[PDB]
Amino acid sequence: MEEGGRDKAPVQPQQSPAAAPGGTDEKPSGKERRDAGDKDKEQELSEEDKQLQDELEMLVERLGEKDTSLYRPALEELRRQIRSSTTSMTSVPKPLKFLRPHYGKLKEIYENMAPGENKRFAADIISVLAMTMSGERECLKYRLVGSQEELASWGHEYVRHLAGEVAKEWQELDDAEKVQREPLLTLVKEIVPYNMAHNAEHEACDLLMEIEQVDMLEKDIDENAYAKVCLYLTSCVNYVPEPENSALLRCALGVFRKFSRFPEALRLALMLNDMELVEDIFTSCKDVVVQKQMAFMLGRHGVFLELSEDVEEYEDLTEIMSNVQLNSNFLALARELDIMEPKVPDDIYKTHLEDSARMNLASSFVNGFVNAAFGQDKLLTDDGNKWLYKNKDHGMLSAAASLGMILLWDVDGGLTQIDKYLYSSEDYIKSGALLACGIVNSGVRNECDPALALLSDYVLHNSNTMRLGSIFGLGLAYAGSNREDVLTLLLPVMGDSKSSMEVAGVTALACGMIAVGSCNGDVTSTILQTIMEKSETELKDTYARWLPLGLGLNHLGKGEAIEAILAALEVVSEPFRSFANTLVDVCAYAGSGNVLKVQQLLHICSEHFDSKEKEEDKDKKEKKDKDKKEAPADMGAHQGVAVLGIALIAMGEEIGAEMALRTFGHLLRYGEPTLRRAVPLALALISVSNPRLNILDTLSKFSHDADPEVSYNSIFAMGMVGSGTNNARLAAMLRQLAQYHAKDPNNLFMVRLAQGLTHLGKGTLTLCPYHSDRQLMSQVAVAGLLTVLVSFLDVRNIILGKSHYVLYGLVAAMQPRMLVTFDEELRPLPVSVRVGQAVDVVGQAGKPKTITGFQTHTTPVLLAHGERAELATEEFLP
Amino acid sequence: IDINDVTPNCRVALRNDSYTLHKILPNKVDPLVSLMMVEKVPDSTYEMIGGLDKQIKEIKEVIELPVKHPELFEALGIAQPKGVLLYGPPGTGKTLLARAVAHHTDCTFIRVSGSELVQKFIGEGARMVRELFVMAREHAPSIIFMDEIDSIGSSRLEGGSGGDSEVQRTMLELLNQLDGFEATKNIKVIMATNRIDILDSALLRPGRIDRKIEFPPPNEEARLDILKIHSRKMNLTRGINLRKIAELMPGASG
Amino acid sequence: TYSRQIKQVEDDIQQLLKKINELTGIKESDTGLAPPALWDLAADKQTLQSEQPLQVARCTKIINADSEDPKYIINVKQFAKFVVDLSDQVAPTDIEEGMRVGVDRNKYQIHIPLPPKIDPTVTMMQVEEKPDVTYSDVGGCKEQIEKLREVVETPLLHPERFVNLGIEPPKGVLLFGPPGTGKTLCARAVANRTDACFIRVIGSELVQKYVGEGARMVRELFEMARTKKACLIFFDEIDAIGGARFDDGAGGDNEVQRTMLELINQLDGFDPRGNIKVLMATNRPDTLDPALMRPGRLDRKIEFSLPDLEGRTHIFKIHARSMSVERDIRFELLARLCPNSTGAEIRSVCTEAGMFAIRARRKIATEKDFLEAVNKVIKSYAKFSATPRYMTYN
Amino acid sequence: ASKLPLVTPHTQCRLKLLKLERIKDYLLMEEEFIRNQEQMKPLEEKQEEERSKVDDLRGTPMSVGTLEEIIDDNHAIVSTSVGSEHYVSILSFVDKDLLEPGCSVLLNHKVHAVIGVLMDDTDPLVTVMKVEKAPQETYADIGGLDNQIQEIKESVELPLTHPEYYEEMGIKPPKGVILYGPPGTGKTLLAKAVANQTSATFLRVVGSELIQKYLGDGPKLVRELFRVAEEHAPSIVFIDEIDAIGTKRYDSNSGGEREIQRTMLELLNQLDGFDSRGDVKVIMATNRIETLDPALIRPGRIDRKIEFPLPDEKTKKRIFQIHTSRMTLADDVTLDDLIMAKDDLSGADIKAICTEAGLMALRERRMKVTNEDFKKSKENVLYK
Numbered sequence A: 001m002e003e004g005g006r007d008k009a010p011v012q013p014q015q016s017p018a019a020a021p022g023g024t025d026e027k028p029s030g031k032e033r034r035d036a037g038d039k040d041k042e043q044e045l046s047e048e049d050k051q052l053q054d055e056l057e058m059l060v061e062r063l064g065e066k067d068t069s070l071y072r073p074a075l076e077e078l079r080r081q082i083r084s085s086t087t088s089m090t091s092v093p094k095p096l097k098f099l100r101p102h103y104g105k106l107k108e109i110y111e112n113m114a115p116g117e118n119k120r121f122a123a124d125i126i127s128v129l130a131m132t133m134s135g136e137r138e139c140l141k142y143r144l145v146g147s148q149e150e151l152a153s154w155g156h157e158y159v160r161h162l163a164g165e166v167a168k169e170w171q172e173l174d175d176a177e178k179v180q181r182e183p184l185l186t187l188v189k190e191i192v193p194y195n196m197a198h199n200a201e202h203e204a205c206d207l208l209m210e211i212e213q214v215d216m217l218e219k220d221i222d223e224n225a226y227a228k229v230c231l232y233l234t235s236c237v238n239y240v241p242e243p244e245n246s247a248l249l250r251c252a253l254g255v256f257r258k259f260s261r262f263p264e265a266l267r268l269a270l271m272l273n274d275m276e277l278v279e280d281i282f283t284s285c286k287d288v289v290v291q292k293q294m295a296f297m298l299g300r301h302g303v304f305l306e307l308s309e310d311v312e313e314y315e316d317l318t319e320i321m322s323n324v325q326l327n328s329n330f331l332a333l334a335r336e337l338d339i340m341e342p343k344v345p346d347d348i349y350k351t352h353l354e355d356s357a358r359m360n361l362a363s364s365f366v367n368g369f370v371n372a373a374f375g376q377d378k379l380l381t382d383d384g385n386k387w388l389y390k391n392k393d394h395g396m397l398s399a400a401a402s403l404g405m406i407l408l409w410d411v412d413g414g415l416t417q418i419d420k421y422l423y424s425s426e427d428y429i430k431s432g433a434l435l436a437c438g439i440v441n442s443g444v445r446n447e448c449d450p451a452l453a454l455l456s457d458y459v460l461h462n463s464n465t466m467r468l469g470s471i472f473g474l475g476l477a478y479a480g481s482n483r484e485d486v487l488t489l490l491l492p493v494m495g496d497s498k499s500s501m502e503v504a505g506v507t508a509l510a511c512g513m514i515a516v517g518s519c520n521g522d523v524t525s526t527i528l529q530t531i532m533e534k535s536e537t538e539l540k541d542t543y544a545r546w547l548p549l550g551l552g553l554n555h556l557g558k559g560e561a562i563e564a565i566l567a568a569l570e571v572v573s574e575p576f577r578s579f580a581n582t583l584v585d586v587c588a589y590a591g592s593g594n595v596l597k598v599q600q601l602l603h604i605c606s607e608h609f610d611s612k613e614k615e616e617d618k619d620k621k622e623k624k625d626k627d628k629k630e631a632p633a634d635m636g637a638h639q640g641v642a643v644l645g646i647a648l649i650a651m652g653e654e655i656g657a658e659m660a661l662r663t664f665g666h667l668l669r670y671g672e673p674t675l676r677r678a679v680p681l682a683l684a685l686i687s688v689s690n691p692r693l694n695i696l697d698t699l700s701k702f703s704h705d706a707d708p709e710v711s712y713n714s715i716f717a718m719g720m721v722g723s724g725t726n727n728a729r730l731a732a733m734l735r736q737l738a739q740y741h742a743k744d745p746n747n748l749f750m751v752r753l754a755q756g757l758t759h760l761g762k763g764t765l766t767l768c769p770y771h772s773d774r775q776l777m778s779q780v781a782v783a784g785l786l787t788v789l790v791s792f793l794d795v796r797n798i799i800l801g802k803s804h805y806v807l808y809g810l811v812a813a814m815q816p817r818m819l820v821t822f823d824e825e826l827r828p829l830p831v832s833v834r835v836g837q838a839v840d841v842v843g844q845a846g847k848p849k850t851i852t853g854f855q856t857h858t859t860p861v862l863l864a865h866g867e868r869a870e871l872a873t874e875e876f877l878p
Numbered sequence B: 001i002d003i004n005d006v007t008p009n010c011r012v013a014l015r016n017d018s019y020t021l022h023k024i025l026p027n028k029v030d031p032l033v034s035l036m037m038v039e040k041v042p043d044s045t046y047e048m049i050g051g052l053d054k055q056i057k058e059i060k061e062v063i064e065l066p067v068k069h070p071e072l073f074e075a076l077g078i079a080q081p082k083g084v085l086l087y088g089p090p091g092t093g094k095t096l097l098a099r100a101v102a103h104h105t106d107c108t109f110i111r112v113s114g115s116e117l118v119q120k121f122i123g124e125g126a127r128m129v130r131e132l133f134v135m136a137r138e139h140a141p142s143i144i145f146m147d148e149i150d151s152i153g154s155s156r157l158e159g160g161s162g163g164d165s166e167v168q169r170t171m172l173e174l175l176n177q178l179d180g181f182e183a184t185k186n187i188k189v190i191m192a193t194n195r196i197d198i199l200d201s202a203l204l205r206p207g208r209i210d211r212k213i214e215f216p217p218p219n220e221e222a223r224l225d226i227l228k229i230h231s232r233k234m235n236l237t238r239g240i241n242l243r244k245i246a247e248l249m250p251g252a253s254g
Numbered sequence C: 001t002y003s004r005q006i007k008q009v010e011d012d013i014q015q016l017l018k019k020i021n022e023l024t025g026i027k028e029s030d031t032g033l034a035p036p037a038l039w040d041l042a043a044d045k046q047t048l049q050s051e052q053p054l055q056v057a058r059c060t061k062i063i064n065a066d067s068e069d070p071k072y073i074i075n076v077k078q079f080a081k082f083v084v085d086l087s088d089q090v091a092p093t094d095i096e097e098g099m100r101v102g103v104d105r106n107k108y109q110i111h112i113p114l115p116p117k118i119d120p121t122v123t124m125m126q127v128e129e130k131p132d133v134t135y136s137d138v139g140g141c142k143e144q145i146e147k148l149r150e151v152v153e154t155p156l157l158h159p160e161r162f163v164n165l166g167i168e169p170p171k172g173v174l175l176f177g178p179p180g181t182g183k184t185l186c187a188r189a190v191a192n193r194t195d196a197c198f199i200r201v202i203g204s205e206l207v208q209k210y211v212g213e214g215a216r217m218v219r220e221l222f223e224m225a226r227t228k229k230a231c232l233i234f235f236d237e238i239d240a241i242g243g244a245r246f247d248d249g250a251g252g253d254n255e256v257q258r259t260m261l262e263l264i265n266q267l268d269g270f271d272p273r274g275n276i277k278v279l280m281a282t283n284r285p286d287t288l289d290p291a292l293m294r295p296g297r298l299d300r301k302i303e304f305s306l307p308d309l310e311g312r313t314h315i316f317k318i319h320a321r322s323m324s325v326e327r328d329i330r331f332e333l334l335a336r337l338c339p340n341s342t343g344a345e346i347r348s349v350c351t352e353a354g355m356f357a358i359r360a361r362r363k364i365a366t367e368k369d370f371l372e373a374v375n376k377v378i379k380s381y382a383k384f385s386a387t388p389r390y391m392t393y394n
Numbered sequence D: 001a002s003k004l005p006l007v008t009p010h011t012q013c014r015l016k017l018l019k020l021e022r023i024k025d026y027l028l029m030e031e032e033f034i035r036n037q038e039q040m041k042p043l044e045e046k047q048e049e050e051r052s053k054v055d056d057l058r059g060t061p062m063s064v065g066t067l068e069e070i071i072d073d074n075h076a077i078v079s080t081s082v083g084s085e086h087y088v089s090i091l092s093f094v095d096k097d098l099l100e101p102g103c104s105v106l107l108n109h110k111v112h113a114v115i116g117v118l119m120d121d122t123d124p125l126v127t128v129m130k131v132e133k134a135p136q137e138t139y140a141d142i143g144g145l146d147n148q149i150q151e152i153k154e155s156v157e158l159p160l161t162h163p164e165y166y167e168e169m170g171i172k173p174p175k176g177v178i179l180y181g182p183p184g185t186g187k188t189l190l191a192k193a194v195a196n197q198t199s200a201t202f203l204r205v206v207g208s209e210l211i212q213k214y215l216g217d218g219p220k221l222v223r224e225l226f227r228v229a230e231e232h233a234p235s236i237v238f239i240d241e242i243d244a245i246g247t248k249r250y251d252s253n254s255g256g257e258r259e260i261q262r263t264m265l266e267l268l269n270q271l272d273g274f275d276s277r278g279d280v281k282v283i284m285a286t287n288r289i290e291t292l293d294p295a296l297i298r299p300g301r302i303d304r305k306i307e308f309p310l311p312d313e314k315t316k317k318r319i320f321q322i323h324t325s326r327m328t329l330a331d332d333v334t335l336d337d338l339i340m341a342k343d344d345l346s347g348a349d350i351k352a353i354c355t356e357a358g359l360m361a362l363r364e365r366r367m368k369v370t371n372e373d374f375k376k377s378k379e380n381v382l383y384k
């Protein structure tokens, strides 16, 4: 190699620092002049971020590193101007001279004091001059300083101002990925007190640029998915004004504040609803937002939009109250029935091409599955009526309710259709008719029969199980309304303390799907009834399927978990009687990240050999491991699958050999080859040594997913194997139901509980009893057949793009592709790589698919989500 | 018995009840040895040459040199020749002057004739022909020799000519292989024929064959030299005057 | 800030995960060992329920029988033939002659019946999969699609109106036309939409080395087809398995004539195949044998011809609806510029227009790109064009 | 193992650390749960006892067989090497997922029960027609063309390097390419350059080897070749001098001219059949394109036709400059004199002249080449 010659800096400037010890005294001019000349030369070389090895900062580490370390403290004659030239010259090399743990040694140059206005001279670097210094200070120095002593000396007073200046300067040159690194520094510093950082960044974001707001809001919503409870509340309260204060869209804030309702507080949701009602913004945006504000994301929004200007602006709430359900039914039977939906498919029954009452009972379910999307039948199910007078009285009631299930979402003439066959004077016909009427009017939330017809059936409960078959339908028809009158009316049924235990259980399930938040008196009354009834008894798990389920549903949708702890303290008992310990705990944990909490809950008993002592606790723990799947971010799924394989299937006799495949249904409902092949491996095999009925339930959960594909014919092959093995009375009905449920029609397969963009979904509550409905033997004869059929009925059928205008003129102008799965990209961030599709129809848009627009459409109504964007006309693009 | 000593394709002794490995038998004859014993090429050497000095020089400059001295060719920066063609009337020395050259430079002599007795020694089915290289590249300094049969050497054409299933198409395939797609070096091909004017045009392109050597019928001096060479193996009498005997022969062949 | 610490933590986590996987011990697989988590329960029960309780049970073939006593004559491929009887648990009803049976190793007693031989080179022809084309991208030939679907699918879907009306539907169909027209694509669509079998076979697969092999393969194909309920067979490039009987001089190309004769014989005479529907395609039908084209074997003769004017517009629209083009491209002019062309040429025109757009930098293909792609693909490549000498089917 | 591909942060942001921490916590919880039963209720070794007993059941003499048929209830018919076939049972530790008819199955010696599955034995034809290492230097050695290279690049290289340009506007890359022109013009050299530069597996075959001496062997070769190409990987198939399959007739062929037709039909079937093709690229080269069947080169099978014309004077000078870069040329020689040597001189003649001149200089033991060497070399090479 070669040394010297061209290295002018390493000759004169290196000897100048050596002679500085002799120049400290009787040479005040030179100590500033040499520093200024070196700073100017360094700034000239550092004006470009390409030559890291500067001739002064990098070449001084041979012997000048100690000189820089011995500049401020080993002088004793620093001035008010020399100190600036000492701190500035020592803050640049000390940050990188040290080893990896340099965050704890940044106080000797830069953190000691602020030299002048170094932020003025820090605009020529990205993350080297001052951004690195701010990050180092916030990593260790400010973290320990500002954890509880934010008010301190210049190491914390001006430190906050410097950090804010650095955060502003990150998004000041180009608003590049350094702007994204600014949110990281804002989150790391004062994570719990993130409100101050958010307030500091809001002022910069509002006045920064008009196009620098959408990306910041998207990044904030992207990173809002994981934080502490207080941190999550602060984030949800800081990002609300991002689309409302800084931005003028005024439509994505109300839609995106759903995550700020259950997690933070109900008062936040009430304030958001009040503000949306007050901020009318004419009618277009407000009506578009409120159309999916009845049962798509949340409810009880038709009572706060009744202002004094109820003429054209505030009257639309009425359309939300009752007209929304009728409009949805008309759309499902108008744009789909006239395109591809025939009068009666009946194709599932004809698949057996290539005799007990069980077949007759499953025929009703098959007919209901194939009669979806307003499939009203006028005496088209005469087989069920004929079989109603032979056997299976409960099956007859299920068949009668299947008539209402055929005419789903009907409130116009559904009651007359049910009353056509209702007049039978039977202990099961009345219950079936009531269930059919309730299923027909699901989601209407109207005052059709609150206490007129439903109360008429409830007032004659001096009879058999007909009393219990008259509250599930009424509760389902009032699930979307949290009115306290219905809850109070249903409370006396559970509190009657009569022999009708089934009525009390159905009342608890019905009220859980109506109100799940405040009014702890209902939960206290349910707990008192359970303590009075189940304490002096040792009977079957009818109480366990009603008391823990009722307690969890009554206190469902609250992330504070204080109510759950209070209930656990008030329900202190043995672990066998404490089956609600994990059920109420997981009901209050609808959507969140609780891997550590799950491990702690499973730490009570990991295996413990399951010595017939805490079987209810083990079942609750297994069900709990199925949780944390509402918003798993496609990360916890693999770990959960591995844990289920290595813990339940790998080792188990009763708990791990029967309910191991139960969690597969709750994991997902779209249907993927990996899960469909893992479950088939443990379901197709006979394994007669184990509980074959459990294997049948495993198959029923393998095919629990809707939207069947062309591979479902393989299951039909197993049907051939079911002729001799897997006896008909114990497996044929289950296999037929599993095959039929997946391919019901073509639409109405959304059982994943995901509304719009990332909504947690209250529909899982309707699926919550269903997951608890199939956990034992004796299939379904009296209770299961009445709940497994109508457990969930709140699925949006098909359409994702329609004008929904006053004249409804526009039909379809879109282009479909795969869903958007990008986080950081260029300005027009790519969505997917499946642009190979383009259709001009308003039909099925696909589950994991998104449709974009062209021809200067841009969806000027919502442009975010909703599946019912109005897409207002625009002509600004020639 | 250690595994590393158990090389593939070896003879071993197996016990009866458990079929466990017991010993290692001496060896098995390689397929190359069997094939060459079947062909029975009558090897020779330089001392059996009559009046072919310049041919010897020409073939030495192409065959011997780019094996022992590759640096001599790298100094000039030229490609190493790979193919040689020999032509002349039959019975003139071509095979003898390719076997002696192969023997003196210590090269494995392989000849292919498309027969079917030796087909079991190459491959089970041998749908292609390049598979011979699998048996050739493990004897790296080797030479492949193919002689054109009398179907063209003597019978020329069958009435419409067309193509010869032997010799020429095999050489086309071989020369197409070792023209850049071959990694192993020190492999060469030799051709023997007569009346080069009947070669197909695809094989007369300038970039294919790097040298062509001629074998004219012997003259009086060469005939006398061959008579002198081949007259040693008999009990002769002092004074024969072989010049007259050589002059009597009107130069037919050797 | 702490990028190094995070990277080290992630690397340590990955290494620990790999180490834990190695610890669990799902290893080996040199000999075909299943992972321990799979055969963990199947470790000891099979030792005493599958090793001694189960026997070797060799397979043999019965040749004939006699009355009033079983006394069955059993033949094997390598050992001798014996006289034997049944076992205790087998009825004498399902012991019909000429079919494979199970036999002991010591006393030679029949135990179970077996299915017959299958010749795996014939078994590989079952499709077992579905291509991904539909009838929605087969534009330009609506009438041919209707005429083909009237016979291929409808009788199999609703077999109640034909029986009620006492009409027996046709069985075979042949598709002919110039190359590139569409035949194989239509066959793909049919195989996609179907629900029964789909046994595909190409004529070049029936040319065997030994004498008397093609007829055997055809017999095995039709036996396997008859075994199942009812499903379809597809013959591709039928003009390679038989042209015409022309034996003059030295016998040349007549074993293939025997194969063709066996194929002909399997479709008529002494209880025809019955519930099997075949369909064949070729590009030069002028060379097929007269005895093969008569009704009763090839009832339908759908013809595919070059599109006139609107077929070209439909092909252009359906091959370029996943493009990136502007709003002012008219396809009628493009259709008028190629008077006699096939669908393949139009698809190539679209692809070359896209490539010309990609050439320099741009993101949106313009009209000039389409015009110059048409000029370079149709006018310049008309040297080869493959078309003029097959419109005469020669 | 694709456990979690969500590493979108890829920076020093809190997102990457949070995702890594969550994945690590989940993995640690899973490992603790897995080892809870491994350390709390083992009840057996469960590590070496299993292998010991499966080896005890599996005897030391171990024969082989071939699958014929399999029944669903975990047994199958296997044929022995001698010829006898049995009805043995299939064990439960034999990972019954790769059991395929014709595969070598490892059987016991006592009761012939299925106890294992054995790997394959390579194949003595794959190594025959597979390229191992790059032949020579890339396009920098070609010179002259500068226009066919971009077309072959668009056909082959771009989808491998940049499978994003085609996805922006949704088109498919061109299917096939064919190279034609007078002999000695640089088709095989460009194929060599493509094989050097690319990263996919390269398979080559001369068209004169597609005709065999038995009946029904050509179609078998084509089927097996394309099966191999489709089963390895994204690959490139190079067939050169294809026209030689039709312009030459050999008496060694048992069949006449009809077997050539059958081979053609099989080749068309393989090129544009109806089953899924996968991702295979085909390159063809010939110097007589007027004798091929037109139905073989229709759009949809071969999409691009590329012509190689005879070089001009500028290309002649460029080829002189290329081929004498490492030669010690004396100042007497001039390339312009040799430029006008012939009216239709080709690329191969340049290399022939240079090489033979070098040889002639080597004969006389002279390192520097003179003008007379070239003067005699051109006469010795061209004029005959």
Ligand SMILES: Nc1ncnc2c1ncn2[C@@H]1O[C@H](COP(=O)(O)OP(=O)(O)OP(=O)(O)O)[C@@H](O)[C@H]1O
Residues within 6 Å of the ligand: C137, C138, C139, C140, C141, C178, C179, C180, C181, C182, C183, C184, C185, C186, C283, C315, C343, C344, C347, D272, D298, D300
């Ligand atoms: N009606 C059509 N619509 C769209 N594309 C078509 C149509 N007809 C033919 N094609 C095009 O033809 C191409 C190949 O067609 P195909 O191979 O089925 O034809 P063919 O008549 O069977 O050919 P060949 O005689 O060469 O076997 C397809 O990739 C498709 O782009």
Ligand SMILES: Nc1ncnc2c1ncn2[C@@H]1O[C@H](COP(=O)(O)OP(=O)(O)OP(=O)(O)O)[C@@H](O)[C@H]1O
Residues within 6 Å of the ligand: B205, B207, D141, D142, D143, D144, D145, D182, D183, D184, D185, D186, D187, D188, D189, D190, D286, D287, D319, D322, D346, D347, D348, D351
């Ligand atoms: N344009 C060229 N640039 C450089 N070298 C060339 C060129 N054209 C020909 N050559 C030389 O010619 C030699 C032979 O060329 P190559 O065998 O690839 O020709 P081809 O086009 O395949 O002809 P053929 O079909 O007659 O075999 C090359 O190795 C190279 O040295």
Ligand SMILES: Nc1ncnc2c1ncn2[C@@H]1O[C@H](COP(=O)(O)OP(=O)(O)O)[C@@H](O)[C@H]1O
Residues within 6 Å of the ligand: B048, B049, B050, B051, B052, B089, B090, B091, B092, B093, B094, B095, B096, B226, B229, B254
């Ligand atoms: N120049 C020669 N000197 C001595 N013997 C020769 C000469 N040329 C040929 N022969 C004889 O020819 C016989 C072999 O013939 P050969 O030349 O190998 O056939 P071909 O001409 O086909 O190569 C040898 O026995 C050898 O004695």
Ligand SMILES: [Mg+2]
Residues within 6 Å of the ligand: C183, C184, D272
């Ligand atoms: Mg075809």
Ligand SMILES: [Mg+2]
Residues within 6 Å of the ligand: D187, D188, D240
């Ligand atoms: Mg070539």
